Design an enzyme around this catalytic site. Structure first.
Site, short mmCIF file in Angstrom:
data_model
loop_
_atom_site.label_atom_id
_atom_site.label_comp_id
_atom_site.label_asym_id
_atom_site.label_seq_id
_atom_site.Cartn_x
_atom_site.Cartn_y
_atom_site.Cartn_z
N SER A 1 15.19 13.29 36.46
CA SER A 1 13.74 13.08 35.84
C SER A 1 13.73 13.80 34.58
O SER A 1 14.62 13.22 33.70
CB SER A 1 12.75 13.58 36.92
N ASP B 1 10.88 2.27 39.10
CA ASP B 1 10.86 4.01 39.09
C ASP B 1 9.10 4.17 39.33
O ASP B 1 8.70 3.60 38.69
CB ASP B 1 11.25 4.67 38.09
N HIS C 1 10.60 7.43 44.03
CA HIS C 1 10.67 8.80 43.14
C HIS C 1 11.87 9.58 43.65
O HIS C 1 11.99 10.78 43.16
CB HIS C 1 9.47 9.46 43.13
C1 LIG Z 1 7.33 6.07 28.98
C2 LIG Z 1 7.80 7.42 29.15
C3 LIG Z 1 7.91 7.51 30.70
C4 LIG Z 1 8.38 8.84 31.17
C5 LIG Z 1 7.28 9.89 31.48
O1 LIG Z 1 6.11 9.56 31.19
N1 LIG Z 1 7.45 11.14 31.82
C6 LIG Z 1 6.51 12.28 32.10
C7 LIG Z 1 5.53 11.99 33.28
C8 LIG Z 1 4.55 13.15 33.53
C9 LIG Z 1 3.74 12.94 34.67
C10 LIG Z 1 4.03 11.68 35.59
C11 LIG Z 1 2.98 11.67 36.49
C12 LIG Z 1 1.69 11.86 36.41
C13 LIG Z 1 0.70 11.85 37.26
C14 LIG Z 1 0.92 11.55 38.66
C15 LIG Z 1 2.30 11.34 39.02
C16 LIG Z 1 3.18 11.37 37.90
C17 LIG Z 1 4.72 11.05 38.35
N2 LIG Z 1 5.90 11.73 37.99
N3 LIG Z 1 6.78 11.09 38.55
N4 LIG Z 1 6.52 10.18 39.34
N5 LIG Z 1 5.09 10.08 39.02
C18 LIG Z 1 4.91 10.73 35.45
C19 LIG Z 1 5.58 10.64 33.89
C20 LIG Z 1 8.66 11.59 31.97
C21 LIG Z 1 8.87 12.06 33.51
O2 LIG Z 1 8.96 13.48 33.49
O3 LIG Z 1 8.99 11.44 34.63
C22 LIG Z 1 9.21 12.50 30.85
C23 LIG Z 1 10.87 12.74 31.07
C24 LIG Z 1 9.46 11.91 29.52
#
Ligand SMILES: CCCCC(=O)N(Cc1ccc(-c2ccccc2-c2nn[nH]n2)cc1)[C@H](C(=O)O)C(C)C
Ligand SMILES: *[C@@H]1O[C@H](CO)[C@@H](O)[C@H](O)[C@H]1NC(C)=O
Length: 343
Positions: free
Chosen positions: A145, A244, A289
């Site tokens: 992640s 994903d 996930h």
């Molecule tokens: C276009 C960029 C895509 C990557 C991205 O936006 N990110 C942040 C994030 C934060 C929170 C969530 C989230 C929020 C609410 C509920 C579930 C989730 C979630 N989290 N995982 N699955 N669902 C998703 C992504 C990455 C990550 O950290 O994944 C970072 C490395 C940049």
């Protein structure tokens, strides 16, 4: 179990100024070292980081960390759970900097929090050299992640650090799990903006060749795998679900009608396209996930090959191989068209 060591340089800190650290299980008969970067989102301004400190404090502080942890999945020492690297020296590095492993900024009169992820990795490596890393033949920097994106941002810097310190024989490689994202259009109507703001808040750093391509103000581009990967010199194996769950969440996707069907199909095709020139990769057609430290990571297969097998074939290739493939990307166009997807 892996045992906690807080960093001896106590100025290399988690967000709240407490010392960062690592968990270690040594394997004295082995010259392989696996260093794993934990994930867990990020925070990008004072108010957003304050909220995270209230309800996700272990991701911002070492004050409450346990003395041991159990290694699972690729971090397991049991051959049945980890056919790939069960005999390796195992290191788990907790994520306590909230900066996608990119920061180089201390707490100060002007900074409520410290963002030191890039310095934490360098200091772990330096302290491990006195604990046996100096005798390694391979250092695999892995992560899931935000930790997978962290691999892409830091693998070449680890390689250069070991060269400058006088250890040219250690082969540095990367394994990026679930950190390969697309800056695409949302299904319904800002991740690229949050990353851009975060970089300024953290004093974030990106790999040098990628920084020189995109130049000042545009370093956010280097957080996207398909843009930073071609600039890297170290070998990197990429693991990414075609559908994903984190990607779908930021795209605002939650009896599917035509518009959404086309959106999901186009997302899988785009992801597959970005991996065409990635020779070592594992990308199943699943909505998930799940990550490589889970105990049942051996169960998924692409074209009849599991991930532990593909990683073994990758090791052999770094010494095409008959019956030992390394490029494994599903071609079927809808989640769970692969029967081995996690339930
Ligand atoms: C276009 C960029 C895509 C990557 C991205 O936006 N990110 C942040 C994030 C934060 C929170 C969530 C989230 C929020 C609410 C509920 C579930 C989730 C979630 N989290 N995982 N699955 N669902 C998703 C992504 C990455 C990550 O950290 O994944 C970072 C490395 C940049
Ligand atoms: C400890 O870490 C800080 C911050 O990275 C660095 O400036 C300093 O030189 C380090 N001290 C030692 C003795 O390594």
């Amino acid at each position: 179990d892996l045992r906690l060591h807080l960093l001896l340089n106590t100025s290399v800190t988690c967000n709240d100024g407490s010392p960062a650290g690592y968990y270690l299980k040594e394997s004295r008969g082995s010259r392989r070292w696996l260093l794993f970067l934990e994930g867990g989102w990020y925070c990008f301004n004072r108010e957003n980081c304050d909220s995270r400190y209230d309800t996700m404090r272990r991701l911002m502080s070492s004050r409450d960390w346990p003395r041991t942890r159990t290694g699972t999945g690729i971090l397991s020492s049991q051959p049945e759970e980890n056919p790939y690297w069960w005999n390796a020296n195992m290191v788990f590095i907790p994520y306590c900097s909230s900066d996608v492993w990119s920061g180089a900024s201390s707490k100060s009169e002007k900074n409520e929090y410290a963002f030191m992820g890039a310095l934490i990795i360098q200091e772990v490596v330096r302290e491990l050299l006195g604990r046996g890393l100096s005798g390694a033949k391979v250092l695999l920097l892995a992560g899931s992640s935000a930790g997978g994106t962290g691999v892409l941002l830091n693998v070449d810097r680890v390689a250069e650090q070991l060269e400058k310190l006088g250890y040219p024989a250690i082969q540095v490689r990367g394994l990026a799990d679930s950190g390969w994202f697309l800056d695409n259009k949302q299904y319904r109507h800002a991740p690229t903006e949050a990353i851009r703001r975060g970089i300024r808040y953290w004093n974030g750093v990106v790999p040098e060749r990628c920084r020189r391509q995109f130049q000042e103000g545009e370093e956010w581009n280097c957080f996207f795998g398909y843009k930073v990967y071609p600039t890297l010199r170290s070998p990197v194996f990429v693991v990414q679900w075609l559908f994903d769950e984190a990607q779908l969440t930021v795209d605002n996707v939650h009896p599917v009608q035509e518009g959404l069907r086309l959106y999901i199909q186009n997302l899988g095709r785009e992801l597959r396209h970005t991996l065409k020139d990635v020779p070592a990769s594992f990308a199943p057609a699943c909505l998930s996930h799940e990550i490589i430290i889970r105990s049942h990571w051996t169960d998924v297969q692409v074209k009849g090959t599991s991930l532990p097998r593909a990683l073994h074939c990758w090791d052999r290739s770094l010494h095409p191989l008959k019956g030992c493939p390394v490029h494994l990307v599903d071609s079927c166009p809808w989640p769970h068209c692969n029967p081995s997807c996690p339930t």
